[model samples]
Target: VSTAPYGAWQSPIDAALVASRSGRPACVGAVGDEVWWVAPRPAEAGRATLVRRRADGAEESALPAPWNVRNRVFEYSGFPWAGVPRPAGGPLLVFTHFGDQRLYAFEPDAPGGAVPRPLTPVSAVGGGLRWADPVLLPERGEVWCMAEEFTGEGPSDVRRFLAAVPLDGSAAADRSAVRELSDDAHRFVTGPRLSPDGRQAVWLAWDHPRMPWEGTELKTARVTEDGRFADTRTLLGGPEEAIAQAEWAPDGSLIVATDRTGWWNLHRVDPATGAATQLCRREEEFAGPLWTPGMRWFAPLANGLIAVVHGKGAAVLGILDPESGELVDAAGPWTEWAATLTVSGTRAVGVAASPRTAYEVVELDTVTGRARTIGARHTDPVDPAYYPEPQIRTFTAPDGREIHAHIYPPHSPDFTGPADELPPYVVMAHGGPTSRVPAVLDLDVAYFTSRGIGVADVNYGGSTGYGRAYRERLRGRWGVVDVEDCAAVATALAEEGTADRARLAVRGGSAGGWTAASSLVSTDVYACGTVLYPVLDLLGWADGGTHDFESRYLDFLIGSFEEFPERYRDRAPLTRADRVRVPFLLLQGLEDPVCPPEQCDRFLEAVAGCGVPHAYLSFEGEGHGFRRKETMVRALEAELSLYAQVFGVEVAGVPLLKLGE
Candidate 1:
């Protein structure tokens, strides 16, 4: 084998291939023996279209191009499409179009070439009207969904409630025709779930300051004879307890996943009695932070069994029998299951991924205890030997606390790093600070690994997948705990001889970018870093800069804006820009409202003349995250070029990023 320096090995996995395969199947559902999902089409400008697998196992796109089956509720969106089987024919579908954030209805099995018809009227308000997590009630001639309406120009002036849109398209031009199902008691609400008897409905709601993971209230209502909800009651959740998901069982009982015991565990709740019984008590999480409205961690089967996704660090699909209180996980190569699951008969469908496989639409049959990939199956674009072998490790923080991380060592099919050299490592700080990176075969991670660079994805203290107490370690310590945990993992890797101590770099996007930049400024652990669409200034972020969903996020991450204004400024990367010694790369999407380009611009202004080499690249059409193929290709190449230049390695075919001195 040819010997080369780490970060300089030749690899078959190109930036183009990674960019082309950027989109994965998500939000899997089932309708009339058909498994449906949203598949990303990066070539079509990153729009997600509806795809369905028929009973015969033939997969095809149910929706055409430019008809994006995505929503904008809370801006993060959710399950934007749902379907119900027609009495005499195929399934009738309801979806939220991403371009206008309007609800639409379609019948793929219709004889004519029927087009999607708008069911919700357009709003010219601040963010307009957006719908998510739709439930198609074809018998009622309506579709129920979480409706987010902006009342004013301010981001926080939006209100969310459950609403029903007529499937007859009568409300398409008239806003008055839309029927409001629930009041806006809470600032945020998920899609409503109807009970098996159709006499009751349930939903989860939360207000500002307290995110969904922190606290949520489970609301139950009785269906009136006039087709309206009445006698609504706050059932099983409160300000301290967070009920992530709730579904009605066949016996008319409610199954909820709550974090009252410091871990999100499945609990059977009696809605009428306000009583809850723990289904299974485990430190692992059954649900995660509900950033979007349509996330589902569990789906109830018709025969009293529940299909659940649960685990710590990496999630697994399981079947929970509440009567026996026994949970049996489906055996597969998959390690991480998406928060989208649907059950059709004894078969459960969800998106799952593994260290050796990309995210695919996986189906688990409870009757046969078999799991298989049904759609979006992983096919190696390059040689499998190029994929890095991951190691799930737990490192000790400075205070002896635990820091979980997935370490992927350099792997090359044709080349190897010098015998005496340790591979350069990139510490990946995942976004959401509340989100955890799974040990999945991500082409992005493979992009670095195949080139002889190791990667350490740190699920810092604030990350989910762990118990609530583990995530709470970041309470009032966002910049501190997240940065420290990432450094701990990186330091441990370097000390263990798995990574080059002198060539270590850090990279992250969104909140992760905050951590990466903070790591570089707060410590001398890395040679350089890459920051993307980051929260560089907390003062601006908490004030009136970001979207309404996370406007009060700093209140929990740091402290109350009024009570700890100084801390906001002190912990922000903007405040410590002058202290940044290492060279870095900053990338942003101009259309991102969550972490706007203005923050990056302001940060560049603050770091001006700091004598450190840095580059800032902004894309026009990208938002929040880079999804377009060109944007991803350029971003990945730029990131690799930054590491190549900073680590003093030679990687050909990458553009030389011009750093501002």
Candidate 2:
């Protein structure tokens, strides 16, 4: 065992390996006996490729690169891909391509593999026509999906509705043949969940000024003779009701997860009377924020067994019987569950990961209560001994509220730091002020921990997994509460001698970037901070300053512009630039529509002469998140360089980031 200075410890995991292990799985589904998912290819210009595992556990790519299966519907695209079973032939699959913004139908197992035929037309307007959260109806010969159609050159002039596309390749050349399924009263909607009997169609819809988790309505309608929706009615949701998901039980009964009782609990709704019967009532959340379309918090099995994820601090996958109140959990080491789910025969599939393992596709047999990985399982690219063992800790905030976080303390099997010195810690605030950070293994976190830097990823106020009341903690206090909670965690660690009190640092991306910048502006607890694509200018983040989907979200996070105009200015980091005295590093993407570079550019302009010792690094061809291998490598290394220089620790192979003198 050798003792070394912090941030200079040798480890097998490097920036190059972090780039290689960045494959993320999304749009997961179960097709017959096959498991399919969208895998990211960062090296090939950051294209999203489709992959699958056959019935016999053979894993391979379902399609080649340059075939991106993604969409931009409402920006945070939901499930843009779906599949249907065939009695005698291979399963039919469809997906929304990112480049063309059109839905394409393809049969992967066909003779010589089928080509993707366009099912949705190319729009003449700005953002084109996008589709997501599709429901494939083989019997009806159609695919129902949420369509986002633009009218003019700007992305703001867009309309979202539930539309139907013919699966027979007839709409491949024209636009008039497609059918609009439901009315256009909603600004945003999810794909229709058809009843088992095909008599009723239930879906979710919400309007502007209220994000999905803030409020939504569960709309139900009847299928007419021509297969069109008619007699539409609002079943059991409103502006104050947050419904995450709604699916149909095998008995044609409506099953939903709503936050009517301050907790997202499962309920079976009567299609006729619109009354709800709770299957299991608990204080923990059975659902979460619907940041994207077709996010499944729970799914129904053929035997009426409901597969649900519920937890207070961490989530678990469980099977519930709607007939009795008995619920059985799938035994596994996985603690965090992704929002995607599917059921085939007696088994259910979900994507999950734990602190010890990375994300992988997992299958659970409800009857046997045995869970096995089907695809996308983690493989160690380096020695597992260098990985940080995480500790889920709950710290008390200064205001007597509880803050949840995952603590990854520095650990290395080959070397141990001296007990006389405390390691520097970085308080990581997650992206969504509304989303919670899962305790999953990541090469990036491992890179930091292996270098003797402790990490504390905080689930501050407004994070999900707690009840609705806890999420509401950041409703009107976006900048204040989130900063206070994160600072409290850092202070607690220093008080307990777990981290260095003089070398504290804060870091985050997106809204987390907002929190980190706000931390530098509001407090002196941290010696430095790293902000990535932050919302620094509240004055410019209103309706026109950002994308239409989240443009008006500031209304709930802060307050309505008409009433709380000054609050926006007061809490914004850009407006309070004089208070930002600590050294900081700022990173941004030039093509980020969510948090545009104009704000970050102006933030640097405002503080240029103030001498805060800051550096701004922006990348091209990248959007909201960094996806390319080279871009990620540069960003990760630059971040380490900032930390190394600030704390006087040695780290090799990174260019020194110049700060404001």
Candidate 3:
């Protein structure tokens, strides 16, 4: 079997790829005879812009930038994109620009009109604060938006709240006209949705010290006649319950996914009584937070049919019946396919791929469970001679807890080698210490394994989709359990002969980055390492003045500053950076709020002081993660090149750059 893209596999085709090069497409509204989409050009920097192609596939148009890039400063935060249809009549398209966090609009048909005009100006009262996705209240010519304002100069002094703005683009200068729905100190309010009749607005909020998944309260209130809110009620929220995605059912009822029952399941909630009834009970989670664009809840179809992209081994496209509370069919066991599905009426469309298949846009017959390919993604394909299927395995942690992982074998059709020869292994630690690594096809992993490197995606402690108890394993034991499980996974892979014991390397970003650095300092299993925007100093993170959502995150993961001073000192890898003896590569974004560049710099300095071989690369305009394509590509290239130099492997077409060489 070959590993090359679209080799020996039935490649599926998608309609949305015309405007997208990342192989992922975001749906924009259908304008005139064409359906529009905002796609990020694979080779371009910054955010994806608007593009449209006709239904008949004849006409195509590229909209111009509506706002001045020079005047607008790119602001980084969570969920930065918003595309909403205009409520006040014209063909104007409203979206959130990363530059200013202000709402802007564009006319699809206006001659020479490519850029969007500013609709909502940056709030002066909130110190040029920005807004989230605009929930359109078309009937009233208003758009409901969520904005986070900094009350104090410090990062922790910020507060998130909800507001409503007119669609005519006149709310920027009118402070008294904007309605404030909810305002609370040290709390975050998010996910606002309007009822079909436009009589109410519902949202979710959680206070300081607890992450959104750890605990939160669901709030619902009626929209008053004079454009004010009343009848406010706390629908559902507490310590044991984690409410994920929420959306209004076609019939106007609220449906939510909660983990209150051990597993994340769908629940129908009564807005008036604040009562929730189970919709579907299962061992898997229904959804997760939207880290990217084009995310939606269960896409409701005609006759109570709903199509949901759920989390199982990986995110799968499934058909569910809300009335019966049962899944009709699920289409995945995909090893490398990360699929996203969308439904309009009874028709369902999505993107799917596997190790051998580049992403393909496909259409599914919801009633029959049949899928037809529309178009296959055409990226620079990988050579098939060096591809091997990843092995999904589970091992027992030192604490007797069973952990899941995905192990890729080093194989290439070009390499006529026996299976007994152990290959160099790179253990991958995923960020979100709260996230899980599933068996999926990743080009980055392919880039390494193609050159004789094996990879193990560790689903360490605190990862979700496993039960609530398992997900909470890292809660007060973040550094200890996370690092231990990573080492355990490496040991298991090495013992199974999937990797060379002497050639083991570790890598991760953000939380995973912390685990990687921690493993090098705390364990001797890994020989070389790469940490991207790693959280090296735990105490520095708390003092760095992070965003509001993560301000009190340390309170749960590591105890408060006053409560566990010794533990923080012990857990932080920076304290023992001198102990790191392995060759390491560190990548950081200068503007990263979570793990600031200074922390990364300090660790690099310590490594130098110890005379350990290491390299540090910093990006100027990037944030927590590299959103710009060039930076992302560079980071991937550098990491793989670093591994190749350390492992003594040579990639055919890719160049390997040694640190300071």
Q: Identify the leading candidate in terms of lDDT.
A: 1
lDDT of 1 by residue, 301-415 (tens): 9888899999987889999887888989988899889888999999989898888888999999989889999998898898888899999999987678888989999998788
Expressed as tens digits, the lDDT of each residue in 551-633 for candidate 3 is: 66777787787888887789899999888888888999997876779888777766775767778889998778765667776
Clashing pairs in 2: none
lDDT of 1 at 104: 81
Q: After superposition, how far is residue 240 of candidate 3 from its true place, in Å?
A: 2.8
Candidate with top TM-score is 1
Q: lDDT value for candidate 3?
A: 0.66
lDDT for position 5 in model 3: 20
Candidate 3 residue spans exceeding 4 A from truth: 1-23, 26-38, 51-54, 57-91, 123-127, 173-177, 289-297, 330-342, 349-351, 358-363, 372-380, 383-387, 417-421, 650-661
Candidate numbers, best TM-score first, in rank order: 1, 2, 3
TM-score of 2: 0.98
Off by over 4 Å in 2: none
Q: How many backbone clashes does candidate 2 have?
A: 0
**Candidate 1 residue-pair clash tally:** 0
Q: Give the TM-score of candidate 1.
A: 0.99
lDDT of 2 by residue, 1-661 (tens): 7998877788888887898778667767888888888888888777788887898889988778788777887787778799877876688999988888889999887888868888978877878788998999887899998888887776578888888899997887777888889877888899999898888898999888899898899998998867899989899899998989999988787889999989999999989788998999989888998988888878898887898877786777888887887888777888787777888888888888876677888888987999988888787787788889999889987567898889999988877777788899988999988889888888889989999999999999899989988899998899988999999999999999989999889999999999999999889999899999999998888736787788888988998989999888899999887788888988998998899999798888888888678888899988888888888888888888889989889888677878774
